């Protein structure tokens, strides 16, 4: 499968490692852009050289209890960074933003994929996304992403994620976005407890029936911290194990913090699927 955006293509024949670049008010320091723009570009550079092919630029934290960011705060931080990256490098760039104006402006400076945690649910976001013509990633979640309150109960979490994606592909089609520009994300860690998360990971090979690319982001999350009982920085081994289980089942983009190590794990996976009579574990 190939994605086309901004006069380029991304070939999803082999797994892609997507780096994380968050430029929130609390990390893209001291007011609305300091010299944190060369930090962001240094950081971009390291990830590309460690082998990342996509970079996910977001201006709003998605963690429990995270602050809301205003449109100006996001325009101020995200658009500088997306622009400077696209000028200097070959990488594909996706933007995680929920706001229509940030979608429109990030298209204008060279963003390739709109990767919104809220799946374009805000007023005018679908419309803006559609207008840009860019690839959009749809993500399951139940509730508000940044709540600090307990995980849903589901009749069946796999059945519910699957029926959510059928509903969102339709909505997007009704707004003129072709199915061919969609990517799907089960949304690990968002509205799911530890059991729900491993159920979705165990059955990731089943979401290929949509015949859409799968983007996955399990890096350093609670499904790893709770299972092993370790804090956020001692989660590498467990994050690499989730990355490999996902790629063995055919996930096309893996969103991680440790780019070097995951690229190395992905090489072993590729060498292995290359030798497999059907390029996927089921």
UniProtKB/Swiss-Prot annotation:
Domain Pterin-binding: 15-267
One CC-aspect GO term: cytosol
The EC number(s) this enzyme carries: 2.5.1.15
Recorded catalytic activity of this chain's protein: (7,8-dihydropterin-6-yl)methyl diphosphate + 4-aminobenzoate = 7,8-dihydropteroate + diphosphate
UniProt: (7,8-dihydropterin-6-yl)methyl diphosphate binding residues: 62, 96, 115, 185, 221, 255-257
Annotated binding of Mg(2+), by residue: 22
Needed co-factor(s): Mg(2+)
Manner of cofactor binding, per the entry note: Magnesium is required for activity, even if it seems to interact primarily with the substrate.
Outcome when changing residue 62 to A: Increases resistance to some sulfonamide antibiotics, including sulfanilamide (SAA) in E.coli strain BW25113
SS bonds (residue pairs): none
Single GO MF annotation: metal ion binding
UniProt activity-regulation remark: Sulfonamide drugs, for example sulfamethoxazole, act as competitive inhibitors of dihydropteroate synthase activity. Inhibited by 8-mercaptoguanine (8MG) derivatives.
Pathway entry: Cofactor biosynthesis; tetrahydrofolate biosynthesis; 7,8-dihydrofolate from 2-amino-4-hydroxy-6-hydroxymethyl-7,8-dihydropteridine diphosphate and 4-aminobenzoate: step 1/2
Keywords: Folate biosynthesis, Magnesium, Metal-binding, Transferase
Subunit and partners: Homodimer.
Family per record: Belongs to the DHPS family.
PANTHER family registered for this protein in UniProt: FOLATE SYNTHESIS PROTEINS (PTHR20941), FOLIC ACID SYNTHESIS PROTEIN FOL1 (PTHR20941:SF1)
Function: Catalyzes the condensation of para-aminobenzoate (pABA) with 6-hydroxymethyl-7,8-dihydropterin diphosphate (DHPt-PP) to form 7,8-dihydropteroate (H2Pte), the immediate precursor of folate derivatives.
Protein name: Dihydropteroate synthase
Source organism (scientific name): Escherichia coli (strain K12)
Biological classification of the source: Bacteria, Pseudomonadati, Pseudomonadota, Gammaproteobacteria, Enterobacterales
